[PDB]
C-alpha cells in the first residue's frame, strides 16, 4: 500500500515541465519498466490484484493526466503516445470491471489534445465518442444544462466538416505502408475497429435527437451545407452563419479554428458540383458566383484541388476563363476519384460498356413494362415451367428411390474409398 507515489509522480512531472524535459524520457521509461515488472511479474507479497480498483483507478488517472498534459505541454509527442499505449494495455488487463468515473474526463481530454495534430476526422470521432460518453455519464452523471449540449453539438459538427480527402503524397511516392495498419491501430485506440468516415460521421451522431438540441446560431447553417441546394447561392447563403459562429468566446474557441478549413470544405463541395452544372464559365462570372475574400487566393486553392485531381478545370488559360468540359477525356479526375463530398447530381458521360449495357437493359425495360407481346410469351413460358415441375414430380418420385440408395451407400462406399486412400 502507501500511495504517496502519486504525489511523487506529480512532483516529477512538474520538474520535467519546468527544468529540463529530457527527464521525461527517463522517468517515463522507469515507470513503464515498473508497470511491466508487476503486470508481467506477479511474484511477491505485493498487491494482490483482483478487484481492488481503488489504487488501480488512482494510479491510472494519475499517470494519465500527468502524461497527457506533460506531452501536450513541452511539445512532446512520443511520450503522449507511450502514455496512451500504457492506458490501453491497462484497459486490456483491467477490463474485468464495469467502468467508473474519470472515463469521460480522460476521453474528452484526449480528443481535445488531438484535434489538430491528427486530422479533425479521427479527432471529431473521439469528440463524438466523448459526446456519447456524456450520454451514459448523463444517465448516471445527470447534467441539467442546455449550454453543455450546445457546445457538444458544435464540437461534433466542426471535427466533422473539415477535410473531405487526404493528400497521400508520401504514399503516392513510396509503396506504401507500413502506413495503414498504424491508422487501424489509432482507430482501435479511439475505440473504433476501422477508419472513421466523413459528414457521414454526422449522419451517424445525428440519428440521435441532434437536429434539435443544436443551438440555432448553427441549426440553420447545415440546413444550407448538407440540406439546401444550390451551388450558385451556397457561398452566399452560408456567409451569415459563418459570421455568427466566428465570434468565438462563448461557443468554444475550439470550434472557430475548425471553421476556416470547414469553410474551404464548403467551397470544395461547391467546386465539385459546378463541373456538372456548367461546361465552361468566364472567370469574371465565376468571381460573382462565389462570395469570398479574394479571387487571387481562391483560384490557387482551386488549381490546388485541380492539381490534386478533385476536379478538372482550365481555370488558367490565356483569356482567364475556365472550361470544365464535356468529357474531353473521361477520367475520375473530374469526378473526385474515390469519394464525393456532395449531393449526387452527375451529368451523363460515356465510359466503357455504357452504350453496350444501356442498349441491353434500357431497351429491355420498354418491352417489359408496357407490352402486349411479352406477357403471352411468358404465360407460355410459365406453361413450359409447369411442364418441367410436372416432369419433375415424376422424376422426384424415382429420385426418392434412387438418390436414397445413392445417399446411404455414399456414406459407406465413398468413405471406404477414402479409407483406402489414407
Partner 1 sequence: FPGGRVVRLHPVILASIVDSYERRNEGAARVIGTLLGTVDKHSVEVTNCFSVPHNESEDEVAVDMEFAKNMYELHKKVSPNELILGWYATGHDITEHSVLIHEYYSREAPNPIHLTVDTSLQNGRMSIKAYVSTSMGVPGRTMGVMFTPLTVKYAYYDTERIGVDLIMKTCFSPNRVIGLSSDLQQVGGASARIQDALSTVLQYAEDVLSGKVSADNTVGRFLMSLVNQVPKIVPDDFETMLNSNINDLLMVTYLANLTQSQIALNEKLVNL
Partner 2 sequence: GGSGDSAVKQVQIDGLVVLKIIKHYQEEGQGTEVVQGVLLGLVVEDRLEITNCFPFPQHTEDDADFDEVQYQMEMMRSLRHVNIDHLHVGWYQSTYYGSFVTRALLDSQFSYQHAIEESVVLIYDPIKTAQGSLSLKAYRLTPKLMEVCKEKDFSPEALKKANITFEHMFEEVPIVIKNSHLINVLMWELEKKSAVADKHELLSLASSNHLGKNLQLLMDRVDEMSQDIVKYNTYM
Partner 3 sequence: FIDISEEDQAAELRAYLKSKGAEISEENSEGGLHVDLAQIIEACDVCLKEDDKDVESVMNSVVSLLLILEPDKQEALIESLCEKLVKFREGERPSLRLQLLSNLFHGMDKNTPVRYTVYCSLIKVAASCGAIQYIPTELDQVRKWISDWNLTTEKKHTLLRLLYEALVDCKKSDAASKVMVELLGSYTEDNASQARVDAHRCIVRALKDPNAFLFDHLLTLKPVKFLEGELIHDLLTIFVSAKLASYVKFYQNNKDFIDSLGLLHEQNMAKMRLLTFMGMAVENKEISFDTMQQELQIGADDVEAFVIDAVRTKMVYCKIDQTQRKVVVSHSTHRTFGKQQWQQLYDTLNAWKQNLNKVKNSLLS
Binding site for partner 2 (CB under 8 A): 184, 332, 335, 337-338, 349, 351-358, 360-362, 364-365, 368, 374-375, 378-379, 381-382, 385-386, 388-389, 392, 395-396, 399, 406-407, 410-411, 414-415, 417-418, 421-422
Q: Is residue 279 a contact point for partner 3 (CB under 8 A)?
A: yes
Find which of partner 2, partner 1, partner 3, none residue 422 binds, CB within 5 to 8 Å per kind: partner 2
Find which of partner 2, partner 1, partner 3, none residue 332 binds, CB within 5 to 8 Å per kind: partner 2
Q: All 3 cell numbers of residue 163?
A: 477535410
Q: State the minimum distance, in angstroms, from the CB of residue 380 to partner 3.
A: 20
Contacts to partner 3 from residues 307-326, by CB under 8 A = 324, 326
Contacts to partner 3 from residues 104-123, by CB under 8 A = none
Q: Is residue 280 a contact point for partner 3 (CB under 8 A)?
A: yes
Q: State the minimum distance, in angstroms, from the CB of residue 360 to partner 2.
A: 6
Q: Is residue 374 a contact point for partner 3 (CB under 8 A)?
A: no
Q: All 3 cell numbers of residue 278?
A: 456548367
CA 4, 63, 254, 17 dihedral sign is positive
Q: Answer whether 322's CB lies under 8 Å from 315's CB.
A: yes
CA dist., res. 130 & res. 158, Å (int): 14
Helix (H, G, I), strand (E, B) or coil at 282: strand
Given 47, 248, 386, 415, the residue binding partner 1 (CB under 8 A): 386
Following CA atoms 123, 127, 132, 136 in sequence, which dihedral angle do they give, to the nearest 10 degrees?
120
Q: Answer whether 249's CB lies under 8 Å from 149's CB.
A: no
CA dist., res. 422 & res. 417, Å (int): 9
Rank residues 266 and 312 by Cβ distance to partner 3 and give the closer one. 312
Contacts to partner 1 from residues 391-410, by CB under 8 A = 393, 396, 399-400, 403-404, 407
CA distance readout (Å), 42 to 33, 51, 96, 252: 14, 15, 18, 46
Given 348, 379, 407, 421, the residue binding partner 3 (CB under 8 A): 348
Rank residues 249 and 370 by Cβ distance to partner 3 and give the closer one. 370
Contacts to partner 1 from residues 320-379, by CB under 8 A = 327-330, 348, 350, 352, 354-367, 370-374
Find which of partner 3, partner 2, partner 1, none residue 278 binds, CB within 5 to 8 Å per kind: partner 3
DSSP labels, 161-212: TT-S----HHHHHS---SSSHHHHHHHHHHT-SS---SHHHHHHTTTTTHHH
Given 7, 85, 168, 282, the residue binding partner 3 (CB under 8 A): 282
Find which of partner 3, partner 1, partner 2, none residue 184 binds, CB within 5 to 8 Å per kind: partner 2
DSSP labels, 33-89: HHHHHHHTT--SSS---SS-HHHHHHHHHHHHHHHHHHHTTTT--HHHHHHHHHHHH
CA dist., res. 387 & res. 243, Å (int): 74
Closest to 123 (Cα-Cα) out of 163, 82, 70, 79: 163
Do you know the residue count of the chain? 422
Q: Is residue 95 a contact point for partner 1 (CB under 8 A)?
A: no
Spell out a b/e string for 304-332, using b for 16 or more CB atoms within 10 Å of the CB, else e: ebbeebbbbbebeeeeebbebeeeeebee
CA 280, 284, 286, 288 dihedral sign is negative
Q: Answer whether 274's CB lies under 8 Å from 231's CB.
A: yes
Rank residues 212 and 391 by Cβ distance to partner 1 and give the closer one. 391
Q: State the minimum distance, in angstroms, from the CB of residue 382 to partner 3.
A: 16
Given 37, 347, 392, 404, the residue binding partner 3 (CB under 8 A): 347
Q: Is residue 288 a contact point for partner 3 (CB under 8 A)?
A: yes
Please report, as ranges, the residues that interact with partner 3 according to CB under 8 A. Answer: 229-233, 275-282, 285, 288, 324, 326, 345, 347-348, 359
Interface residues with partner 1 (CB under 8 A) are 327-330, 348, 350, 352, 354-367, 370-374, 382, 386, 389-390, 393, 396, 399-400, 403-404, 407
Amino acid at each position: 500500500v502507501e500511495r504517496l507515489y502519486h504525489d511523487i509522480a506529480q512532483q516529477a512531472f512538474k520538474f520535467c515541465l519546468q527544468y529540463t524535459r529530457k527527464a521525461e524520457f527517463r522517468k517515463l521509461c522507469d515507470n513503464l519498466r515498473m508497470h511491466l515488472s508487476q503486470i508481467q511479474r506477479h511474484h511477491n507479497q505485493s498487491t494482490a490484484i483482483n478487484l481492488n480498483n481503488p489504487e488501480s483507478q488512482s494510479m491510472h488517472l494519475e499517470t494519465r493526466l500527468v502524461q497527457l498534459d506533460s506531452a501536450i505541454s513541452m511539445e512532446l509527442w512520443q511520450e503522449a503516445f507511450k502514455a496512451v499505449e500504457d492506458i490501453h494495455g491497462l484497459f486490456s488487463l483491467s477490463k474485468k470491471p464495469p467502468k467508473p468515473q474519470l472515463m469521460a474526463n480522460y476521453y474528452n481530454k484526449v480528443s481535445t489534445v488531438f484535434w489538430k495534430s491528427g486530422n479533425a476526422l479521427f479527432h471529431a470521432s473521439t469528440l463524438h465518442r466523448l459526446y456519447h460518453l456524456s450520454r451514459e455519464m448523463r444517465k448516471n452523471l445527470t447534467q441539467d444544462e442546455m449550454q453543455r449540449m450546445s457546445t457538444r453539438v458544435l464540437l461534433a459538427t466542426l471535427s466533422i466538416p473539415i477535410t473531405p480527402e487526404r493528400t497521400d503524397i508520401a504514399r503516392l511516392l513510396d509503396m506504401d505502408g507500413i502506413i495503414v495498419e498504424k491508422q487501424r491501430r489509432l482507430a482501435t485506440l479511439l475505440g473504433l475497429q476501422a477508419p472513421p468516415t466523413r459528414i457521414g460521421l454526422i449522419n451517424d451522431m445525428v440519428r440521435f435527437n441532434v437536429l434539435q438540441y443544436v443551438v440555432p446560431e448553427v441549426k440553420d447553417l447545415y440546413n444550407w451545407l448538407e440540406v439546401e441546394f444550390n451551388p450558385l447561392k451556397l457561398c452566399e447563403r452560408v456567409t451569415k452563419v459563418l459570421n455568427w459562429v466566428r465570434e468565438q468566446p462563448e461557443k468554444e474557441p475550439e470550434l472557430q479554428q475548425y471553421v476556416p478549413q470547414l469553410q474551404s470544405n464548403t467551397i470544395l463541395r461547391l467546386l465539385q458540383q459546378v463541373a456538372q452544372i456548367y461546361q465552361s464559365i468566364e472567370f469574371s462570372r465565376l468571381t460573382s458566383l462565389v462570395p469570398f475574400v479574394d479571387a487571387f487566393q481562391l483560384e490557387r486553392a482551386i488549381v490546388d484541388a485541380a492539381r490534386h485531381c478533385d476536379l478538372q478545370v482550365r481555370i488558367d488559360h490565356t483569356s482567364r476563363t475556365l472550361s470544365f468540359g464535356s468529357d474531353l477525356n473521361y477520367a475520375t479526375r473530374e469526378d473526385a476519384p474515390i469519394g464525393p463530398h456532395l449531393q449526387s447530381m452527375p451529368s451523363e458521360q460515356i465510359r466503357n460498356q455504357l452504350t453496350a449495357m444501356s442498349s441491353v437493359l434500357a431497351k429491355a425495360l420498354e418491352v417489359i413494362k408496357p407490352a402486349h407481346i411479352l406477357q403471352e410469351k411468358e404465360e407460355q413460358h410459365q406453361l413450359a415451367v409447369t411442364a418441367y415441375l410436372k416432369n419433375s414430380r415424376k422424376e422426384h418420385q424415382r429420385i426418392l428411390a434412387r438418390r436414397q440408395t445413392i445417399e446411404e451407400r455414399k456414406e459407406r462406399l465413398e468413405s471406404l474409398n477414402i479409407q483406402r486412400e489414407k
